[PDB]
Amino acid sequence: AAEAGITGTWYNQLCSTFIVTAGADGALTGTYESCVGNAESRYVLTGRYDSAPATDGSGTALGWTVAWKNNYRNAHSATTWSGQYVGGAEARINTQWLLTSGTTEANAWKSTLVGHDTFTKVK
Amino acid sequence: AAEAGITGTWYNQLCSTFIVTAGADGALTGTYESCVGNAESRYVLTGRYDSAPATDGSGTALGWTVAWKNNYRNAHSATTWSGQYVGGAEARINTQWLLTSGTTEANAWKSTLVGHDTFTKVK
Amino acid sequence: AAEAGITGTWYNQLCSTFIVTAGADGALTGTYESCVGNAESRYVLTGRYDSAPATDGSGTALGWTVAWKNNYRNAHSATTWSGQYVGGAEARINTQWLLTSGTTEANAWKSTLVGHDTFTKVK
Amino acid sequence: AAEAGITGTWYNQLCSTFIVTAGADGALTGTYESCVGNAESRYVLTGRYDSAPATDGSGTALGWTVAWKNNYRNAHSATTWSGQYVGGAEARINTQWLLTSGTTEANAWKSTLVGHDTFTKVK
Ligand SMILES: O=C(O)CCCC[C@@H]1SC[C@@H]2NC(=O)N[C@@H]21
Ligand SMILES: O=C(O)CCCC[C@@H]1SC[C@@H]2NC(=O)N[C@@H]21
Ligand SMILES: O=C(O)CCCC[C@@H]1SC[C@@H]2NC(=O)N[C@@H]21
Ligand SMILES: O=C(O)CCCC[C@@H]1SC[C@@H]2NC(=O)N[C@@H]21
């Protein structure tokens, strides 16, 4: 149910696009495009999901990472999204994220932004 | 420098073990073993790192995910670590993490733990 | 504008109630009632807000704390909300929060939940 | 034990100073001085702590807020620290924090930094 539900195109609350394949082994592979920040076009993502989730109505735990380097830009930063997939007619991936920039040691205290993204199958 | 510095075995501040290969393409692949929580033995990890970091003394941004399912246990949860690699004689990976459990919608507000891990090359 | 806008009753996305007075000195004082977790009735809150915010269209930074002890219950925990007030016809307080429980040292790694609350003037 | 243990001067891992009084009613009052960021001299803090903590060896949950406005500077930002006090010969306040800046709606996704501070009675 989770494998067959996660694979595809997802859209966050504004204008970012998350394209993912959920493998039978628990792998997440695809691309991410952010409409905000120091980013242009698609970036590689990889992650993991629970490939045997509970059947009690609980969501499916997952996470993925994007390092913000591609052929066009390098922001010297990486975001991880940690969350859960919720199935049904209004399917959702509800996440919180951590965006860490490469910094000097003196600036390390301010290296990491935190936020949240909600993904849907329709933009 | 970052590719040649990240690959290997890392140990957190207590008793967890992070085994990773940093690929030329920006990939992180390996295994994680936690000495705490609902976990036993090794779990698959995958992630991304900045494969062309700044040369100004800044750290190398990275992140990875573990879904807490293996052949022994399934915690129905996933952790993402977001952080930076700092090179030199006392090499470090400094991270913050988000641990999301699969929950019901009613319990989603309490789905996610936050913390921090510091990894070194010596335990 | 911020002082005259923050004072009053606020409601989160589900069923919690945030009653606050914004003082001229930057103080936040009031009570919080949560409809979830180990909580019953009202709890004291105190916090701070920027009493001279920017006039460029930016929000007003603020934060507050609740320790989850009152005359009825003690959860041995505390939540801090950090966020910004956004004025106008659809006024909002957009927050992220950290909920720390008192733990043993062995369990400290799992002491802290993270989430987000959006408050409006209408439930 | 917690009331008699929290009151006083605390120092973080680098060069910040946290001066606090823990009241019998659960109040935290005092001043904070940061050696980093857009900050100079002392700022008002207020917070809450569990004034009847568990006696089983668990820490004492607490939190506080600083809005980064004083007579010298206004950063248009606020930090909340959420954590626990650990008593004994090497007393500690272990915290995680959220630093929210006032932003435009377009920039709200990057409003909030996350980190951690460990406070001791000796610098
Ligand atoms: O500016 C950077 O360092 C790289 C781009 C970051 C974009 C962030 S990732 C979290 C949030 N969700 C999005 O879709 N975009 C932003
Ligand atoms: O209990 C679970 O849900 C699975 C195990 C979680 C272990 C966590 S991940 C973050 C922290 N760092 C570690 O090395 N272990 C804990
Ligand atoms: O269970 C506890 O430890 C005390 C109650 C916690 C309620 C939390 S605080 C963050 C979130 N927002 C709410 O309104 N309620 C929950
Ligand atoms: O730059 C600002 O917006 C105001 C100063 C922020 C200082 C932060 S608060 C968290 C961390 N701990 C400290 O002692 N200082 C920094």
> How far is it, in rounded angstroms, from Cα D3 to Cα C100?
18
Q: How many CB atoms lie within 10 A of CB C31?
A: 15
> How far is it, in rounded angstroms, from Cα C109 to Cα C104?
10
Task: Quote the Cα angle for D66-D68-D70, to 5°.
Answer: 110
C64 is in an annotated binding site: no
Resolution in A: 1.3
Numbered residues of the known binding site of B for biotin:
32, 43, 81, 97, 109
Would you say the CB of residue A77 lies under 6 angstroms from ligand 1?
yes
Q: Does D115 touch chain A (CB under 8 A)?
A: yes
> How far is it, in rounded angstroms, from Cα C52 to Cα C26?
9
CA distance D107 to chain C (A): 9
Would you say the CB of residue D66 lies under 6 angstroms from ligand 4?
no
Q: Does B102 touch chain D (CB under 8 A)?
A: no
Please choose, from the candidates A117, D45, A74, D110, the residue with its C-alpha nearest in 3D space to the C-alpha of residue B51: A74
On the 0-12 / 13-18 / 19+ scale of CB atoms within 10 A, A87 is: middle
Q: Does C50 touch chain D (CB under 8 A)?
A: yes
Of A14, A37, A113, the CB nearest to D113: A113
Q: Does B99 touch chain A (CB under 8 A)?
A: yes
> How far is it, in rounded angstroms, from Cα D71 to Cα D40?
9
In which residue are the tokens 């494969």 written? B51
Are B47 and B61 in contact by the 8 Å Cβ rule? The answer is: no
Would you say the CB of residue D99 lies under 6 angstroms from ligand 4?
yes
Residues in chain B: 123
Of C76, C80, C105, the CB nearest to D65: C80
Give the Å distance between the CA of A37 and the centre of ligand 1.
5
Strand C43-49 relative to strand D60-69, pairing: unpaired
Method used for this model?
X-ray
> How far is it, in rounded angstroms, from Cα B27 to Cα B29?
6
List of residues 6+ apart from A89 with CB closer than 8 A: none
Task: Quote the Cα angle for B51-B55-B58, to 5°.
Answer: 85
Please choose, from the candidates C54, C53, C43, the residue with its C-alpha nearest in 3D space to the C-alpha of residue C20: C43
Classify D5 in phi/psi space as left (phi over 0), alpha (psi -120 to 50) or beta. alpha
List of residues 6+ apart from B89 with CB closer than 8 A: none
> How far is it, in rounded angstroms, from Cα C6 to Cα C28?
9
Strand A8-11 relative to strand C74-86, pairing: unpaired
In which residue are the tokens 């659960």 written? D26
Nearest residue of chain B to residue A2 (CA atoms): B102
List of residues 6+ apart from C55 with CB closer than 8 A: none
Every domain of chain D and the residues it spans? 2-120
Residue type, A79: T
Structure tokens at C31: 């009570």
Are B54 and B23 in contact by the 8 Å Cβ rule? The answer is: no
Write the DSSP assignment of chain A as a string of letters.
Answer: -HHHHHSEEEE-SSS-EEEEEE-TTSEEEEEEE-SSSS--S-EEEEEEE-SS--SSS--EEEEEEEEEE-SS-EEEEEEEEEEEEE-STT-EEEEEEEEEEP--STTGGG-EEEEEEEEES--
- Give the ligand with the smallest distance to the CA of C16: 3
Would you identify the CATH topology of the domain D2-120? Answer: Lipocalin (2.40.128)
Please choose, from the candidates D85, B39, B77, D97, the residue with its C-alpha nearest in 3D space to the C-alpha of residue C105: D85
Please choose, from the candidates B16, B11, B74, B18, the residue with its C-alpha nearest in 3D space to the C-alpha of residue B45: B18
> How far is it, in rounded angstroms, from Cα D18 to Cα D40?
14
Q: Inspect the interface and report whether the beta carbons of B63 and A65 lie closer than 8 Å.
A: yes
User: Which residues from chain A sit within 8 angstroms of residue D111, using beta carbons?
Assistant: 115
List of residues 6+ apart from D20 with CB closer than 8 A: D6, D7, D8, D10, D28, D29, D30, D45, D47, D64
Largest CA distance in chain D: 48
Would you say the CB of residue C95 lies under 6 angstroms from ligand 3?
no
User: Which residues from chain B sit within 8 angstroms of residue A63, using beta carbons?
Assistant: 65-67, 78-80, 98, 100
Hey, whose CA ends up nearest to atom 4 of ligand 2?
A: B38
Give the Å distance between the CA of A68 and the centre of ligand 1.
8
